[PDB]
Amino acid sequence: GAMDPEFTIKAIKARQIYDSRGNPTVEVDLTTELGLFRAAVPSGASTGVHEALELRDNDKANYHGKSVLKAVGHVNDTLGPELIKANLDVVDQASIDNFMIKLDGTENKSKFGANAILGVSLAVAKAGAAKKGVPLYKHIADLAGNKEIILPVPAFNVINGGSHAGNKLAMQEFMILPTGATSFTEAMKMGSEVYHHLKNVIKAKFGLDATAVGDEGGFAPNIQSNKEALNLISDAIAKAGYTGKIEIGMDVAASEFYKDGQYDLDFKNEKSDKSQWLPADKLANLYQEFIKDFPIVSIEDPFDQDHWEAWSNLTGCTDIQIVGDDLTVTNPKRIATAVEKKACNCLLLKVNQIGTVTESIAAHLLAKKNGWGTMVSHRSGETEDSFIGDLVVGLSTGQIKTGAPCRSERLAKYNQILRIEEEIGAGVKFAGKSFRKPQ
Amino acid sequence: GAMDPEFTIKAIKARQIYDSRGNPTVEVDLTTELGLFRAAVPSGASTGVHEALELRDNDKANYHGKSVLKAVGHVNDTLGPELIKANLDVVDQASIDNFMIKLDGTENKSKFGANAILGVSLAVAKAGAAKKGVPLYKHIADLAGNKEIILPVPAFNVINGGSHAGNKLAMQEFMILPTGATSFTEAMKMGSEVYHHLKNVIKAKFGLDATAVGDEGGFAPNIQSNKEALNLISDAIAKAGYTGKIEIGMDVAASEFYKDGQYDLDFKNEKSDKSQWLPADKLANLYQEFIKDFPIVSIEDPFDQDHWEAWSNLTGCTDIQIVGDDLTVTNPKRIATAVEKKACNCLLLKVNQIGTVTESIAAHLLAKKNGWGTMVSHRSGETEDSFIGDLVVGLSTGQIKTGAPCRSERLAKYNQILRIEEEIGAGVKFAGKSFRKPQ
Numbered sequence: 001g002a003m004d005p006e007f008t009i010k011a012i013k014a015r016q017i018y019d020s021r022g023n024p025t026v027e028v029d030l031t032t033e034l035g036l037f038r039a040a041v042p043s044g045a046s047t048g049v050h051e052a053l054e055l056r057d058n059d060k061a062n063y064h065g066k067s068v069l070k071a072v073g074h075v076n077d078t079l080g081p082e083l084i085k086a087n088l089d090v091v092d093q094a095s096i097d098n099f100m101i102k103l104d105g106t107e108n109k110s111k112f113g114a115n116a117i118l119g120v121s122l123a124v125a126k127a128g129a130a131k132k133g134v135p136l137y138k139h140i141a142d143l144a145g146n147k148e149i150i151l152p153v154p155a156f157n158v159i160n161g162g163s164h165a166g167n168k169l170a171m172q173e174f175m176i177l178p179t180g181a182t183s184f185t186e187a188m189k190m191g192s193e194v195y196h197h198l199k200n201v202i203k204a205k206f207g208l209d210a211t212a213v214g215d216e217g218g219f220a221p222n223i224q225s226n227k228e229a230l231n232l233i234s235d236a237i238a239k240a241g242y243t244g245k246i247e248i249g250m251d252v253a254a255s256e257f258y259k260d261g262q263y264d265l266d267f268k269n270e271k272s273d274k275s276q277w278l279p280a281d282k283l284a285n286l287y288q289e290f291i292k293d294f295p296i297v298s299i300e301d302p303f304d305q306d307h308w309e310a311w312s313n314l315t316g317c318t319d320i321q322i323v324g325d326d327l328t329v330t331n332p333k334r335i336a337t338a339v340e341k342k343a344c345n346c347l348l349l350k351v352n353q354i355g356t357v358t359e360s361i362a363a364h365l366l367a368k369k370n371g372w373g374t375m376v377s378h379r380s381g382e383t384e385d386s387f388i389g390d391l392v393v394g395l396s397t398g399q400i401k402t403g404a405p406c407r408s409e410r411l412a413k414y415n416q417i418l419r420i421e422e423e424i425g426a427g428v429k430f431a432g433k434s435f436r437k438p439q
Numbered sequence: 440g441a442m443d444p445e446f447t448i449k450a451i452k453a454r455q456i457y458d459s460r461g462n463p464t465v466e467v468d469l470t471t472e473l474g475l476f477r478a479a480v481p482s483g484a485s486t487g488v489h490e491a492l493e494l495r496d497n498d499k500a501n502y503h504g505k506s507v508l509k510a511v512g513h514v515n516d517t518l519g520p521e522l523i524k525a526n527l528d529v530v531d532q533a534s535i536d537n538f539m540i541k542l543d544g545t546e547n548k549s550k551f552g553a554n555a556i557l558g559v560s561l562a563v564a565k566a567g568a569a570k571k572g573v574p575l576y577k578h579i580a581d582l583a584g585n586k587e588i589i590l591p592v593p594a595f596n597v598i599n600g601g602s603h604a605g606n607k608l609a610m611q612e613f614m615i616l617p618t619g620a621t622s623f624t625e626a627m628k629m630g631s632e633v634y635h636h637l638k639n640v641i642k643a644k645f646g647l648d649a650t651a652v653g654d655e656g657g658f659a660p661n662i663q664s665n666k667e668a669l670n671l672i673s674d675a676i677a678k679a680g681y682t683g684k685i686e687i688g689m690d691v692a693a694s695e696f697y698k699d700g701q702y703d704l705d706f707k708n709e710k711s712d713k714s715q716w717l718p719a720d721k722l723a724n725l726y727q728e729f730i731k732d733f734p735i736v737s738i739e740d741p742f743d744q745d746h747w748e749a750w751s752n753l754t755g756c757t758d759i760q761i762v763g764d765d766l767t768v769t770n771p772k773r774i775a776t777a778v779e780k781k782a783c784n785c786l787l788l789k790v791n792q793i794g795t796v797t798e799s800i801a802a803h804l805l806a807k808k809n810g811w812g813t814m815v816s817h818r819s820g821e822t823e824d825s826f827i828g829d830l831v832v833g834l835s836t837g838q839i840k841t842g843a844p845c846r847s848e849r850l851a852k853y854n855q856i857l858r859i860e861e862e863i864g865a866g867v868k869f870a871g872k873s874f875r876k877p878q
């Protein structure tokens with residue numbers, strides 16, 4: 001039978017679990033002499049085009065093509081056994097990640113799947129922290145050269161539109177940021193109180209059934225305009241008692257209504273008035289109008305993912321945060337292009353878009369070195385995993401978006417940051433108004 | 440400073456976290472020489488009346504009265520320190536639970552809170568399993584005298600009504616049970632596939648916004664009748680390809696439309712036709728009609744929580760499972776009454792309704808000794824905790840309801856049972872058609 005090779009990693013075991021939308025995803029158990037370290041992989045709602053490849057089975061006869069048994073098989077049959085034989089120090093995240101990258105041998109991780117590779121990468125990072133004898137977020141901070149831990153402002157999904165709701169609302173998501181809180185504990189209290197006030201307002205105006213939630217845990221009532229959505233959020237902030245301590249973020253996902261070089265803010269109405277479509281300059285004016293009227297501090301994907309001119313123009317006129325998501329796709333080649341063009345000033349960090357801890361940190365540090373902020377992000381398909389809680393604390397980016405304070409694939413992350421806050425103790429720092437650049 | 444007393448428990452630390460509805464709840468870390476053991480407490484949507492007391496702060500100025508800092512304080516200031524000093528063997532769950540019960544010194548755990556006591560109780564059980572060197576579910580099986588582990592049929596919430604939705608639907612919830620699956624893995628596949636087919640049907644008939652989810656992860660479209668809801672589920676099962684392998688459970692929550700000794704199936708219409716209200720005999724006939732027309736195998740709370748005659752009558756005519764929830768409230772005094780009256784034949788097990796592992800197992804064994812089944816249950820406010828996954832496996836009750844396959848406070852439990860299935864290995868047993876009495 002088996003013989004123990006006395007390698008640094010004792011076992012690596014992948015399995016199929018279910019994500020928060022009820023679809024299979026990958027989980028990895030990595031065992032060392034110090035114990036078992038478990039991590040699971042999130043999944044986005046759709047294909048990126050520039051992302052590292054998420055490997056699905058495409059077996060039409062089972063799970064409607066969405067099982068991840070091939071990815072799981074790659075970990076158990078090849079990636080895991082070869083990494084174990086490599087006998088690498090589990091604290092050297094970079095060597096292990098680069099070994100995996102080279103073993104896969106493709107640019108987009110299309111041999112094993114980014115979902116096979118990332119699950120190991122994340123579990124390795126936990127094993128390395130245990131070997132160091134420090135919490136995961138301190139290990140991540142070391143991997144990033146970060147000398148001061150600072151907790152993030154949470155960015156809570158509250159209102160949804162775009163292709164993710166049947167309302168008229170064109171813009172995809174609206175978020176609240178308690179930048180005026182004095183601690184992460186108080187930020188969570190403020191977000192949860194505003195969220196419940198918003199629920200009460202929606203119930204009163206739209207009815208009880210209008211308070212069911214989407215994938216992120218927020219609401220999608222039958223709102224007609226983006227202005228109405230901002231008004232609704234402002235009313236909820238005012239009823240909650242936090243006007244002036246809550247600011248607003250938007251994720252426009254403008255690629256989804258980019259048609260014939262213009263933008264269609266009524267793209268869910270099939271009889272849309274094509275004379276009402278906005279050129280990028282007119283759309284930038286609308287954003288600027290919302291910024292004057294509402295405490296909007298961050299706008300994500302304001303233009304199409306390849307509309308570099310419009311991005312550069314807007315990022316140059318405004319002084320708020322402009323976040324690349326579909327623009328940058330956690331991809332250093334795209335980030336380098338965005339840096340050169342000054343197209344945005346904040347990177348959305350989705351670790352499973354690139355597929356290792358090491359590359360994720362590198363992408364963050366590339367953004368940071370060029371003066372950008374970083375907003376750590378969930379995916380729409382999440383799990384009970386809380387890694388990105390430690391990640392945003394360890395990188396001290398000052399900002400994470402990982403759901404409404406509703407649905408425990410979202411609260412798992414916020415709860416983990418509360419645990420970290422308690423562990424750090426008195427003197428723990430909270431980014432607050434400096435969320436774009438905490439240090 | 441501190442001095443180590445060399446007691447069996449090294450530390451006990453409670454904290455406030457957020458549940459899946461965005462409300463505070465209790466989490467407890469218990470540390471022994473073998474590590475840290477963490478557990479969190481669920482919370483029901485409303486007050487029971489017969490439940491052990493969930494202690495809330497009722498500070499109107501913070502969290503709208505729902506923080507649990509007093510309960511957290513009881514663990515950290517009194518319950519924890521006294522349990523540690525008691526120096527009890529962590530594998531003796533009963534001694535530790537009974538010590539806590541006696542320390543609180545009240546019938547309903549109203550001094551510390553059932554939410555203070557349960558968090559410790561659950562963490563103790565994990566520490567005891569580690570001391571034994573066995574998985575939690577094997578330790579629980581030992582605590583219960585269970586000699587054969589058998590995995591449960593999951594009961595997935597799919598359709599919601601009653602006071603929990605704005606539809607006309609009077610009955611509170613409809614569930615699918617893949618009793619025809621041959622393994623827990625296949626049961627999860629079947630449930631998730633049917634769930635997604637149901638989503639597609641609802642989107643086609645009611646629109647995309649009708650597919651937002653409630654607390655459990657299921658749907659609440661504008662259904663007019665209970666028959667329509669059953670038809671909708673049957674259509675989804677048929678489109679998924681599993682007719683004959685999926686059965687249906689109901690939770691009527693009939694207490695909520697018990698008015699003037701009758702039952703009002705249109706209780707959400709303020710102009711309800713009082714001549715259409717059903718006496719218990721007529722309501723029992725309606726259930727019997729649904730049982731003839733649909734594969735209904737389980738009905739929970741078919742009558743008011745104190746309507747003993749109607750319960751006894753229905754449980755005597757029918758041969759399907761009749762589940763006490765509001766009737767029994769995981770309370771042995773109520774269970775003894777239900778046993779004597781033959782009012783039901785299945786106990787819904789909600790550990791936080793009674794407040795310790797030991798009392799929960801006793802309530803289960805009381806039901807089992809009298810020929811009842813046991814269905815382990817989530818609460819509407821859940822966490823990323825997965826204890827009740829191990830609990831239903833360890834007791835081998837054959838059935839757990841812990842959500843739709845949607846929202847990770849629900850998938851956390853199903854995922855944990857998948858992990859257990861993998862750990863047991865080949866030959867793992869699945870209750871299947873014997874879910875009411877696996878052994």
Ligand SMILES: [Cl-]
Binds near residue numbers: 251325
């Ligand atoms: Cl996003």
Ligand SMILES: [Cl-]
Binds near residue numbers: 690764816
């Ligand atoms: Cl229930």
Ligand SMILES: [Co+2]
Binds near residue numbers: 160172
């Ligand atoms: Co969305």
Ligand SMILES: [Co+2]
Binds near residue numbers: 611655
């Ligand atoms: Co409900």
